Every structure is written in structure tokens, then in C-alpha cells.
Amino acid sequence: TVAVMSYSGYDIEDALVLNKASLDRGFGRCLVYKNAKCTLKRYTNQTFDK
Amino acid sequence: QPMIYICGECHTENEIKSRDPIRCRECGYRIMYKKRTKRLVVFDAR
Amino acid sequence: DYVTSGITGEPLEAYIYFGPVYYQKLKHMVLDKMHARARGPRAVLTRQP
Amino acid sequence: LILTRLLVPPLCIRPSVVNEDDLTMKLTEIIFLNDVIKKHRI
Amino acid sequence: RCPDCGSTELVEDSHYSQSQLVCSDCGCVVTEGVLTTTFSDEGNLREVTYSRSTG
Amino acid sequence: ADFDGDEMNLHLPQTEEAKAEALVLMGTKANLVTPRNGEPLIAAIQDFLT
Amino acid sequence: QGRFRGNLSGKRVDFSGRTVISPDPNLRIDEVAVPVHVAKILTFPEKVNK
Amino acid sequence: MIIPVRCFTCGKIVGNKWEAYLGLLQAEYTEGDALDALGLKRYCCRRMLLAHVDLIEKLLNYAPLE
Amino acid sequence: IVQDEILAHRLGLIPIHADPRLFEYRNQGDEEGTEIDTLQFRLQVRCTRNPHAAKDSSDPNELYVNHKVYTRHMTWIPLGNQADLFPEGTIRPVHDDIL
Amino acid sequence: SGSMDKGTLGSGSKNNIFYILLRDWGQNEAADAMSRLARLAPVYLSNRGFSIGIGDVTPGQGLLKAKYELLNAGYKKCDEYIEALNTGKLQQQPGCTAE
Ligand SMILES: [Mg+2]
């Protein structure tokens, strides 16, 4: 719900201003998933990781 | 006593406790997922 | 629209353009970009950072 | 000006894992070929 | 052993990024900073068998 | 710079001799005008002119 | 990537940081604002005196 | 994924309107009549239901189920 | 399938019908709390297949029981003497209907 | 007299009032004056209000008439030239050929 106006001086060059009380109600909320993988193997000599 | 894994398809509880190959006791499926932890965790409603 | 100031309480002079626009949030986030190095590992060949 | 001997540089300027630096593999080849000539001529 | 205390309680620990060896007994540093390879030379990595490298 | 996702570095000189040179020679106050022809470069930008 | 152009004239340094930039019109033109998390990494070795 | 409880802009509780909204649509009201009969005046609220995309009905088909 | 942080975020927004003039501010720390400055609710459901269900296999509402978690399922858990100070039914989430 | 604009506050040229302060009174006066302007302008403009919309771009009444009139005249003259060339009656400009 945007307004097009000059306001507060922290918005000069392509910066923009958000409403704190919307961020609290869910706006712009997100998730970030990352991955971590590992493997165990058997060597040519008869031994293996544990 | 041994740890339990959930088969990826039929969700039948399995147990390994060994160097055995990962295979479902019931079906042919070959993917296993660990169970949820038993401890409680505390979150903030923010 | 006609708008009232939220800080002073007295109405603004101009009329303000108001309405719905579709905004999308990009993947560039500052938390994944901050960085600083006091003193750390050095390369073996030339012993610069 | 015409050379008949060479220096092998220290291990500092060619680390262990490049497995070894190509300067090392070059040098081991030079000596190998040199040894070939001397036994071969003998 | 700690050069300042003689005690042998050295613990391997790291600050935010620096890896270091610290006498936990007295709060002293005895070694820090490491030299490692990078990713730029990782792509150039070859391999030679020890048999090839030993004749 | 334009605050559209930019980034900037920063260095912290480690010697009392280097502090004195940075402040005296490289300070902003001493560099309000560009040496190409002497015109001012640090002045007001949009939304302060309006 | 040779010695001259890569390691002698211009080279990597430490005690430095990097981050996004954003606006603030309540700083004097000669001050810069630094986050606390980057103030906790960087140091200056102040000698003790009277 | 699921219905947000509150309207972001003003804070009105819209989380309890989704089922009724689909009910009123299912009786061949228009969208405009549906929203008006649910009592969503301000347009900041109307988008909160109008432009929703309910993915939890779909995402559940892929869930592990007996 | 709802992530825990997101579920906790949703639960916060639900307005509670306690009168706020009867309680003090929790002091910093003291996470355990006490009967003068805290309230407790409990949520617990288990979705199960409906055994009586016929063979249409189409309507989720008929096929399952408690396959929806409304704010009806929150039960007030009195703490200390609050059960006595407050008559029954005056502590509850306001709307009774939120999903 | 007058009013302040880029020619008197902007980063382009001399006659900048911050430049006069720099040369005549030192560095500290020019650095201080800029700082006060940073704190003082936003407080005015953000409570006056200043906006742009599509009312600031829609063309009025007289504009449409002038535009239509001009287009007709221009195309006719363009026609006249291409008629002149393809008939070969066109006089060549004294720096080039007909094309
Ligand atoms: Mg930019």
C-alpha cells in the first residue's frame, strides 16, 4: 500500500522506507533453507569409516 | 533400545543398530528418515 | 487523496498519490554480505591473506 | 653464459601439493634423462 | 606446555575467524594463524600415484 | 554511490603515523573541491534542493 | 596473476571490512557509522602511557 | 502457504473469513458482494482475501500419509 | 507441515480476552513467571481417519476427524489461584473461530 | 532576493554558497552549514508533502490541438520533399548529393 511522497530524509537515492508495524504482522517474512551432506565409504583395504 | 528409522514410502518403523544396508524391512524402498527429537524446544511468538 | 500528517496532526498541503503496487523481495540480504577480518590464515606460497 | 649446472630452488617456493609442483616434475625428468645419457653412452 | 605457566592445559580454540592455540589455564596465546590452499588452485589439482611418484 | 544495493570497503590504519596522514591529508573536510579544476564536489543533492 | 601485478604493487590486506551502504542524514559530512558487529572484530593496539 | 491471521496494513482480524468467503462464492455471489457481505470495507483489507493463493490444500498431497 | 517458527508467529497474533488491568509486568529474566503476571493455554490435537466414513473417498471433511486446527482447541490452564479469582469462561481467545 | 536552486546549492559550479563560505571563512564554516541543511530541509518538505501521480502527466486541452495541427503540417512538408526527389526536380543542397 504505497504512498508516493518525500518523507524523513532517509530515502534520497533509491532507498525506501517500510512500516514497522507491518513487518510485525508478516509482510516480507521469508525462509532460507540450506543443505549439508556427508558420506561414509569402504576402503580398498578391509576397513570402513564409523 | 535401538534407534528407529521411518521408511520413506510406507512409514513403517524400522530398526538397524548395525552395519546392514539401508533397506525397508517390508518393501523394497531404500530411503530412511530419522524421528523427531524427544526434547522440548522454546520459541518466541515474534 | 487528502492526507493528514502523523507527527504534527495538521493536514499536509499537497494531495498524496495512494494505492496498491506489487512488490517482490530479491535474494540479496545484508546478513549474507557483512564481513570483516582482524587477522587470519595466510597462503603458503606468498604469505599474504 | 653457456650453462652446465643448475640450482634446484628450495621447497618454500614450490609447495608440497600443486601431486607436486610442475617444476618438481620437470626437474625429476631432467635428471632422469641425464642419467639415461650417461649410462647409455657408457 | 604453556611457556608462561608450565601447565599442560592447552585447548585448541578459535575466535570469530582466527584459529589459535590458547593456554586455558592463564589466558595466553602460544600459536595462531594458518596457511591454507584456496579454491582458485583447487580446480587445477592433479594427482599422481605413489607408484608413479616412487619409480 | 547510489544505495541501490551497493557495497563499500573499510580499512583501519594501525600506526599513529598513519592516523595523522589519513586525517590531515585524506579527510573530507580538506577535500570539498576536486583538483581537476577546483569546482566543488561535496554539495547538496536531490530532495535537499527541492 | 604474476608477482609484479598481483603480489607486489597491489596485494591483499587485513584489518578491513565490507558491507552494504545505506543513507543517514543525521551524520556530519565527515563521520561514518559502523555496525557493532564489525566494531568487535577490528582492533587498534593502543600503547599504555600516563 | 496458509491464510495470514491479520491484515498487514491496519491489523484487522481477517483469518476467520476464508471459509465463509469460499462459502459465499459457492452460492454464486460475486467477489464484490462476497467481500461486502463479510464486512471488509477498507481496500487494504479486501486484497488480503481477494488475492490469496492457498497452497496448503496442494502441498498436503505430497505429505507422508498412512 | 507448518514450520515451528511460523506456527509460533501465528499464535502470537490471536487476541486474548484477559482484562489487562489485573496483572503486572513480568520482570526482566525470571522466565518461569508466577500467578500474578502470566497466563497459560494448551493446544493438542491428533488428526485421524474417520472409521465410519463411507466409500466416496472425496470429501476431506467426511474422511478425517480434527483435520483442522481452529482456535477453539485452546484450553485455559489455571495457574495458582487464578481459577478462583476469575469465574469460569472469562478467560479465552476472543474469536473462537480463527484457523 | 531570488530563490535557491542547483546553481546555488548543487555540486556543479562556483557561486555555490558553500563554496563562498569555504574560500572566505574556512573549512569549518562550510562543513557546518552543510550539516545544518541536512537536518533542516527534510523537516520542512516531509510535513509540507510533495508527490507525483498521473495527474501530473495527463495532457490537457490545447496540447492536443497543437499536436494534431503540427503533425499534419510536418507530414505535408515531408511529402513535398520526397515528391521533389522522386520527380528529380529537387535542388541539391550545396554540401552533398540529393539523398
Ligand atoms: Mg547503484
Ligand SMILES: [Zn+2]
Ligand atoms: Zn518401506
Ligand SMILES: [Zn+2]
Ligand atoms: Zn599459561
Ligand SMILES: [Zn+2]
Ligand atoms: Zn486492513
